[PDB]
Structure formats: structure tokens, C-alpha cells
């Protein structure tokens, strides 16, 4: 709901913005508007990846041979009210994209 | 660390990046990686091909 | 793109296989070593006192102690022909490199300790985390062994936490001591007549008499220094839950706990047991029982005989 | 919307088509009332929505050959291509720059 | 004070009153007590309970929840005359799962914790987009009547009517699902509106007091046959039965002769007043054997909440008409609504069902709001709508904290 | 246990059957309203007047 709000009202102030700063006219100003979103519906799943924090990372190897045999990293623990008894969940790495997802 | 900061890069590493993110978009918009066909590139291209014929027109204008 | 996108294809296809494997090895752990909350309601089914000395059954003389990490039984082949560093496209050259850091080990796994392969192991740090593990370890022992085929002894204090110990089996005899003097002129008696202690292995359990001893140090008592030094005896293993000087000068014996709970040691190989590195790392993550608990397993136990 | 497979995804993308059409047929009959206009736009806004209840049902249980499957994606490319140079003639720029 | 008696539960449902000890704790209990339902279910000739591979037997309450082993059933909000249930709850112990390629495990989660579209939510939309559909055509048809009453409204409407209708007649008699069923409701809903506009729009002449009958007549008429034929959606049919009964006697009366509307609005108001406290005894007379009492129940219950709604419908449009701030004793009305406002206020929560004691409490709420609207509206100054702003906001947060302090 | 049986002591010794899962069902399909509910629904009055 507040993601709506957003783009409904950064729109429109570019829109009465435009006709604050110049006279221009309305059927220019409604004709950009629908341009504006024809190529918005493109980028939509694009610009809804970085909102949600998803990275991507890309670089030779660390400049380095692969270790295969490298030390795993350590698994957190984790509790609930109710179920106060902790218990280990997995990868801190693998945790964050069950959420960001 | 090791790929943060702002660091050189090279041509692989920019098209590499790009096919990352193709495979990645679609799996958000039709949960599957299988990619048997590319509709992301062709509906963009559309756009482009749309872009490019009103140019096209417009500077046709100016030269009458 | 058609050459990147056919290697991830394939990339996964191994994944699957790697996860249906996984699938397998949970299942048969957890079917031998349950959580303890779960011990009172089968205690009347045919899985309690399963447990044979007689060389094939590779489980007599493990214990649970929690959860953790562990190697699966995945066997990778190294990748032919591999490009050097240089040559090395980027997408793909990371993904084989992440996929090899990951799916070579399975996680929140059931951790063991063997009886049969120190002559004592040193818990350190509060009571509370020290007394938990034990309490497990003994109701463990008491519902997947025999009375026949293992004995236990308790050197205390605190008589106020080991009075729950009064209803299992294990603890009787064909037993619970104030100080090493008491348990010199009763039980040392025995024991001391023979042996040293010797690392064995399920092929060799064959051979040792049939009830083995768990002695339980909670006096620290400097007596203890005679069978200490000599290195034990064999059919015996002594856990000091007190942290004395004695015990605690060996790594390879010692388990360290952290605030968290979370214990550390020495790794150890799954199959064979030994030593593999010097420095302490994580090992599993606590399981517990209360003296209510305990109490109320025990006396489900109590119940059977022979 | 056949490139989306959540439910409420999709749905939002239909719909958005629909009310399109039926919004412009309501503008359209109340300025400039007519006869002919209400009799016109009283047809459109029941038998399109009829048209789209009656394609739902029959197309998920038939079978297509692929030259025909392979038409109705092209649908799509072609009515992209003719919105930008549209726009720009509902927007005069073509007489607006041939007359500077 | 020393002990509690109360009704455990067991296997596949036998009850037995057993005397419990008030203050040993709860996990002291449940093992004894699963040797007792056990001896008694093989002396009854039952076969006892019994475990599934790794688990555990609890003490939980009616509704599933487990009681905290530790605490003593004193301790816990347990009394003599209540009832608990003795349960095996299975181990959740299994192994993690790991996927580190972002663009996999993206996929891989997002479909198992949410639902794709799928053929039989296509054919619900596509029914529902036709009803939205029908009416907007009536619509334009409708009012196209206020300036034309000529018979193109009432010729293009019938056919309409008797299209949509004949296809639901076919989809009724061939539905086999629940699923099948939503879709023909829809269809069906949609019939009555055009052709109650499609009657109402023949008599000829400037609209008004004759062509109304009609439709009110038809539109009580079609709701009510459809709801003897079909009996399901009762509901939404007997809320329309109830507008349209009513409407239709103050537009005979209008037609034929009326002094005042404020005539007929008092006594429409009078009419909903004796039959909201009638409601009850209506919904009651006009609602292997155990089934007989299960049926009935939800029968009752779902015309008494579509009779409470549409009396309010009728009493918040008369109302609101009432309440004019120019005529006469303007305080008058006003204190009539509040009168009106107590009663519906102080009766309301006395139901027991949520959506009849909450839709009521409602109902009150809105005529307020409405008759302060009115009051800002018409008779407006800079004071007045200063002053609605302050009643407006105040009343509703007033409500609010005296059920929330 | 040990207890003191009162003179006037009578026990019930009677069982009932119905089926837990219907049981457990209804209770939680059908019942009265709650003040936990009431506040969402007094939020969203108070907002409609603002």
C-alpha cells in the first residue's frame, strides 16, 4: 500500500511541477505521463530487485585458485517465547535470501 | 572485502553481470530458471524498435 | 549466453542428486540416536536395549550430545582439464567454486562421543551446561544399553542432584559415593586389579567383557592421581564434572563450553574416530534434562527387567 | 499478465486492461448522448467481458499447433511498436517541427 | 480446594470425568493418567491408543494447545467442570536445507509459500467481470430513461435480462461443484437488476410514482423466487426481499395519495422499529438425525443477519431524509436520531453472534456521522463546519476509548 | 496418592463419546467475540471519522 503511494505522488508532482514552472498544456503533460509508464512496466521487476536489497556478486576468483576443501561457515542459533529452547537454523549467508525473496 | 568498494572491471565481467540478471529477473516473475525461450530481451527490444521509428519520423520532419 | 546458461542447467542437476542423498542419512541417524524428550514414550517398544557388543553393530559405545555440523557420504571427482586462473570465465568459475563450499557438508546433524576411545573426557564450564549434558548422556545410555552390558558409578558431594539416580537399573549391581577414600575401599577394590586403558573399535568390541563402566568424578579429590597417571584401566571411562587439573592437561580429552551453550573440541573423523586437528573448534550444540525429566524417565525404566 | 504467475499479479494486470475499456465507453455515452451512441456502447460492455469469460473456460482444456501459439506472442511486439509514434502525433511534434 | 474435577478426552473421542490433583504439577499427571483411559477403553472393548514412531504424549486444552509441563494445575487457569485432552504430538527434528545460487533458491522458495493462477480462479474472474459488466449497461440505459422514457430502454434491457438468464438456467442445472455453483450464483445475482429496470421502465409518461411500483415489485418478487428454487445466497435474496417489500407500499402510497414524505417516513421508521424487535422471532419461523439440528442452526442465523442489516439500510435512509436543519423545530429530528442512536446502541451487543451485534453497534455509528454531515452541508458557516470537525473526530475516538481504556 | 474419603463421597463413573476433531473444530469455527478484535475494529472507527 505505501509503494503505491509513492509512485502515485512522485508522478504527479513532476506533473504539476511542469505546469507550475510553464504553461505547456494538459494533453502533453497526460501523453508524457502514459510514456513514462509504457517504459516503467519494463523496468518494474529490474527496479524491484535492488528495492529489496538483492545483490549480486561477480569478480575473478578473488584473483586467487579455488579452495574446495574451505572451512564451512558456522551455523546460527536461534529462539522462540514459547520455544525457549534454542535450536541451530543454518548459513547466516542463506538465511537473508528466505527473507529477501 | 573482496568484491566491494569501486574497484576496475573488464568487458566479461559487464556482459557476465547482465546474464545474471536476466535469469535472475524472470525467476521473480515466472518462479523457474529453466529458460527455454528469452521474453525478457524481446519485449524490451520492442520498445526500442518503437523509440527508434519515432526518431526516425521526427528527424524526417526536420528534414523537409 | 547458450554455453553459460547450459553449464548452470547442469550445475543443478547435481545439486538435486547431492540432496536426495541427504535425505537418506537424516532418516538412519535420527532412527539410532532420538532426542532425549522423546526416550519416555518408547521406552515400552522393542527399540530400547537394541543395542548389541557382538563386533557388527558399529553403534555400541556412542552417545548423542546434540546438533551440528557433519561431512555427508558424497564422494566429489575433481572437475578435468581445469582452466588456470587466468583462463577462467568469471560467472561460472565462482559458481563451481561456492557450489564445492556448501553442498560439501550437511548441517543440524546428530553429534556423537565414543566411550571406547578415551580413558576420560574433561566437561568445562558452568554446572548448570556440565550437569545438563550428563543427565542426557546417562538416560541415553540407560535406554539404548543394558543393564548387562553397561554399569555406572557416581563419586559425589552433592548427593542433592544425583538423587534421581536411585531408580535405574544401571546403577545397581550383581551406588553412589561420598569421597574417593569411600570409593577406594569398595569399588577401587575391583577395578584396580587389572589393565590399562585401549582405544577399540567395533571389530575389537567382540572381545571385551560384557559390562562396561561409567565413573563420574564430581569430588575433586587429589586421590584420583593413582588411576589418573597410569593411564586408567580398561572396561572404565570417567567424566569430571568439576574441571580439576588432573583431567583438564589434555586437549584431546577436553570439552569446552561456551555461554551459549554451543560446545567445542578437537575434530574428529566420523569413521574411524581419530584425531584430525590440534586446535578446538565447534562441535555440537547442547542437549539437556532436568532432574524431573530424568526422574521420570528413570522410573519409566525402573519398571522392566530381563 | 501471461508473463506474471502469481494470482494477484496477474489478476491486477487484467483487470487494468479491462477497466480501461470500460471506463472510455462510460465517457463516451454520458458527452455527446445519443441514440445510436447508448444503443453502440450498451453492446461493447457486455458482450466484451462475455468474450473473455467464454476464452477462459474453453482455452485451458484444447490443444494449439505451434504455428498458432507462435502468432499470439507476435500480437504483443506489434502493439508495442506503434505507441511512440502515436504519442508524438497526438502530441502535433511531427506539424510542430515541419513548420518550426 | 484440594482437588478439580474435569472431562479428559481421548482416543477417537471418549470422555471420562476424572478428579484430578489441584496443585502436583500437570507433567506428574499424564502418565498414570494414559494408563487409565487405556484399562478403560479395553474393558469398554476399544482399541487403546498408541505411539507413532518418535513423539510425545501431552495434556493440552480443547482447543489443541499444550499446558506448560512445570506448572501446577492451580497455577494454570483450570476449574472444577472443565475439560482437557490427552494428546501425541509428534518430533519436528529434520535436517536443514541449503541453496547459495541466488538466482535458484529465489525460485525454488517463492513457489512453495505462495499460489500461482490456475483454471478454476480464471472462470471466477471471468464470471464476476460479466456482472460488473451487465450493470454498467443497465446503467447507461437507466439514464437514458430521465430524459426519454420511450420504449428503447425497456426493449434493449428484456433481451439482456433473458440472455443472462437462460445461460445461468443452463450452468445450474450442470453444476457438480461448490466451484461450479459460485460461478452460476454470480450469474444469477446479475439477472434481477436488469430486469427489474427493464419492467419499471413500460409504463410511459415523465418517471416517478407509477413506474416505481413496478420495479420494487418485480425486484421483491425475483429475489424471493430465486430464493425458493435455489436456497443458497439467503442472505443477499432476503436483504432485497425486505428493501423491496417496504419500498414498494410507500410507492403505492405516494402514488395513490400522501400528505408529506415526512408522513411515510415516520412511518417507515415506526415499521422497522416493531420488526427490530420482531427479527428474531421472524428468522426463527421462517428457518444420522443429529444433522437435523446442524442444519437449521446456520438457517436462522443467516436470515436474522441479512433482516438486521436491511432494516438499517431502511432506518439510515429515512433518518438522514428526516434531519433537515431548516425546517421547523430543527432539534426536533436531531434528538429523534439520538433517541434512535441509544436504542440500537444499548441493544446491539445483547446478540450473541459477532457480525449481527457488530453490524448493529455500526449502524448506529453511521447515522451520527451522516446526521453531523448534514448539518455541515447544509446551513454551512466557518463556526459550524469548526464545530462538525470537533463532534465528527470526537465521537467515533470517544467510542474507541471507552471500549480500549 | 494418598486422600481422605468423606462419608458423603459419590463418583461419576460415567463416559460420553463424540469425536475430538469435530470438537476441537467447532470451538474454534464458532464463538463469541473477543477485546482483542474489538480494538482493531475501534482504530478503524476513529480513523473513518478523522
Not at chain 3, 589434555?250 to 574428529?268: N, Y
Amino acid at each position: 500500500i505505501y509503494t503505491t503511494i509513492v509512485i502515485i505522488g512522485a508522478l504527479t508532482m513532476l506533473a504539476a511541477l511542469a505546469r507550475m514552472v510553464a504553461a505547456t498544456s494538459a494533453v502533453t503533460l497526460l501523453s508524457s505521463l502514459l510514456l513514462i509508464c509504457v517504459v516503467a512496466y519494463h523496468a518494474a521487476p529490474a527496479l524491484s530487485r535492488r528495492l529489496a536489497g538483492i545483490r549480486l556478486p561477480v569478480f575473478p576468483s578473488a584473483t586467487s585458485r579455488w579452495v574446495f576443501e574451505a572451512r564451512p561457515d558456522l551455523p546460527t542459533t536461534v529462539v522462540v517465547s514459547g520455544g525457549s529452547a534454542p535450536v541451530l537454523e543454518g548459513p547466516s549467508s542463506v538465511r537473508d535470501v528466505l527473507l529477501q525473496a | 572485502g573482496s568484491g566491494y568498494g569501486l574497484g576496475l572491471s573488464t568487458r566479461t565481467q559487464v556482459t557476465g553481470y547482465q546474464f545474471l540478471a536476466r535469469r535472475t529477473a524472470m525467476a521473480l516473475t515466472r518462479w523457474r530458471v529453466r529458460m527455454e525461450i528469452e521474453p525478457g530481451r524481446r519485449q524490451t527490444l520492442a520498445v526500442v524498435a518503437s523509440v527508434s521509428a519515432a526518431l526516425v519520423i521526427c528527424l524526417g520532419a526536420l528534414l523537409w | 549466453d547458450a554455453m553459460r546458461a547450459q553449464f548452470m542447467l547442469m550445475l543443478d542437476m547435481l545439486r538435486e542428486t547431492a540432496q536426495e542423498s541427504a535425505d537418506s542419512m537424516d532418516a538412519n541417524y535420527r532412527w539410532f540416536h532420538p532426542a532425549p524428550n522423546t526416550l519416555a514414550a518408547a521406552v515400552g517398544s522393542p527399540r530400547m536395549w537394541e543395542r548389541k557388543p557382538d563386533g557388527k553393530d558399529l553403534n555400541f559405545g556412542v552417545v548423542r550430545v546434540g546438533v551440528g555440523m557433519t561431512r555427508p557420504e558424497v564422494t566429489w571427482g575433481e572437475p578435468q582439464n581445469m582452466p588456470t586462473d587466468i583462463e577462467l570465465e568469471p560467472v561460472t568459475g565462482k559458481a563451481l567454486q561456492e557450489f564445492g563450499r556448501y553442498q560439501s557438508v550437511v548441517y543440524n546433524l546428530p553429534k556423537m562421543v565414543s566411550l571406547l576411545v578415551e580413558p576420560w573426557y574433561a566437561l568445562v564450564g558452568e554446572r548448570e551446561q556440565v550437569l545438563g549434558l550428563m543427565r542426557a548422556i546417562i538416560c541415553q545410555l540407560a535406554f539404548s544399553h543394558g543393564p548387562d552390558h553397561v554399569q555406572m558409578i557416581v563419586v559425589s558431594s552433592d548427593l542433592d542432584q544425583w538423587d534421581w539416580v536411585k531408580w535405574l537399573p544401571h546403577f545397581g549391581d550383581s551406588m553412589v559415593y561420598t569421597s574417593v577414600r569411600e570409593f577406594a575401599a569398595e569399588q577401587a577394590e575391583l577395578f584396580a586389579g587389572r589393565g590399562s586403558f585401549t582405544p577399540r573399535h567395533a571389530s575389537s568390541s567382540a572381545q571385551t567383557p560384557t559390562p562396561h563402566t561409567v565413573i563420574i568424578a564430581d569430588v575433586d579429590d587429589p586421590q584420583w592421581e593413582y588411576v589418573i597417571s597410569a593411564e586408567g584401566v580398561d572396561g572404565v571411562t570417567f567424566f569430571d564434572l568439576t574441571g580439576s587439573s588432573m583431567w583438564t592437561d589434555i586437549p584431546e580429552r577436553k570439552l569446552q563450553f561456551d555461554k551459549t551453550g554451543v560446545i567445542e573440541a578437537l575434530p574428529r573423523d566420523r569413521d574411524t574416530w581419530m584425531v584430525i586437528d590440534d586446535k578446538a573448534w565447534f562441535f555440537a550444540l547442547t542437549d539437556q534434562v532436568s532432574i524431573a525429566e530424568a526422574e521420570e524417565f528413570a522410573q519409566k525404566l525402573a519398571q522392566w527387567r530381563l | 499478465g501471461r508473463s506474471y504467475v502469481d494470482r494477484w499479479q496477474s489478476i491486477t494486470l487484467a483487470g487494468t486492461a479491462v477497466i480501461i475499456a470500460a471506463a472510455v465507453c462510460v465517457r463516451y455515452a454520458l458527452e455527446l448522448s445519443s441514440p445510436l451512441a447508448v444503443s453502440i456502447v450498451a453492446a461493447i460492455l457486455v458482450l466484451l467481458p462475455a468474450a473473455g469469460m467464454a476464452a477462459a473456460a474453453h482455452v485451458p482444456h484444447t490443444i494449439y499447433s505451434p504455428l498458432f501459439r507462435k502468432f499470439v506472442e507476435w500480437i504483443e511486439y506489434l502493439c508495442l511498436m506503434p505507441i511512440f509514434p502515436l504519442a508524438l502525433w497526438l502530441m502535433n511534434v511531427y506539424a510542430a517541427i515541419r513548420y518550426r | 480446594p484440594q482437588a478439580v474435577v474435569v472431562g479428559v478426552m481421548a482416543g477417537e473421542g471418549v470422555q471420562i470425568g476424572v478428579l484430578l490433583d489441584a496443585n502436583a504439577p500437570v507433567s506428574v499427571m499424564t502418565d498414570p493418567l494414559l494408563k487409565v483411559v487405556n484399562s478403560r477403553l479395553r474393558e469398554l472393548g476399544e482399541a487403546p491408543l498408541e505411539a507413532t514412531g518418535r513423539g510425545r504424549w501431552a495434556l493440552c486444552l480443547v482447543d489443541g494447545a499444550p499446558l506448560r509441563a512445570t506448572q501446577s494445575l492451580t497455577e494454570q487457569d483450570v476449574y472444577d467442570g472443565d475439560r482437557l485432552w490427552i494428546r501425541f504430538i509428534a518430533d519436528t527434528e529434520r535436517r536443514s536445507q541449503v541453496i547459495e545460487h541466488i538466482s535458484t533458491a529465489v525460485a525454488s522458495d517463492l513457489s512453495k509459500r505462495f499460489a500461482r493462477i490456475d483454471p478454476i480462479v480464471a472462470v471466477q474472474v471471468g464470471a464476476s467481470m460479466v456482472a460488473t459488466g451487465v450493470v454498467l449497461a443497465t446503467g447507461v440505459l437507466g439514464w437514458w430513461r430521465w430524459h426519454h422514457n420511450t420504449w428503447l430502454t425497456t426493449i434493449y434491457t428484456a433481451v439482456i435480462g433473458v440472455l443472462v438468464l437462460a445461460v445461468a438456467m443452463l450452468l445450474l442445472m450442470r453444476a457438480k461443484t461448490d466451484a461450479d455453483r459460485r460461478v452460476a450464483d454470480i450469474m444469477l445475482m446479475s439477472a434481477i437488476m436488469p430486469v427489474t429496470v427493464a419492467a419499471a421502465a413500460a409504463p410511459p409518461g415523465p418517471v416517478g410514482s407509477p413506474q416505481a411500483v413496478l420495479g420494487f415489485g418485480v425486484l421483491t418478487v425475483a429475489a424471493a423466487l430465486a430464493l425458493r428454487f435455489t436456497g443458497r445466497r439467503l442472505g443477499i435474496y432476503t436483504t432485497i426481499v425486505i428493501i423491496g417489500a417496504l419500498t414498494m407500499l410507500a410507492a403505492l402510497a405516494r402514488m395513490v395519495a400522501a400528505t408529506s414524505a415526512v408522513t411515510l417516513l415516520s412511518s417507515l421508521l415506526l415499521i422497522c422499529v416493531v420488526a427490530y424487535h420482531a427479527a428474531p422471532a421472524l428468522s426463527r419461523r421462517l428457518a444420522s438425525s443429529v444433522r437435523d439440528v446442524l442444519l437449521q442452526a446456520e438457517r436462522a442465523r443467516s436470515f436474522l443477519s441479512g433482516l438486521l442489516t436491511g432494516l438499517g439500510v431502511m432506518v439510515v435512509v429515512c433518518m438522514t431524509s428526516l434531519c433537515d436543519p431548516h425546517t421547523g423545530q430543527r432539534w426536533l429530528p436531531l434528538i429523534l436520531a439520538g433517541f434512535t442512536s441509544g436504542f440500537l446502541l444499548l441493544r446491539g451487543r445483547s446478540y450473541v453472534d459477532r457480525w449481527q451485534s457488530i453490524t448493529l453497534a455500526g449502524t448506529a455509528v453511521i447515522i451520527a456521522a451522516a446526521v453531523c454531515v448534514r448539518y455541515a452541508l447544509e446551513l454551512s458557516s466557518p463556526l459550524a463546519v469548526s464545530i462538525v470537525a470537533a463532534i465528527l473526530v470526537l465521537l467515533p475516538a470517544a467510542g474507541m476509548a471507552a471500549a480500549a481504556h
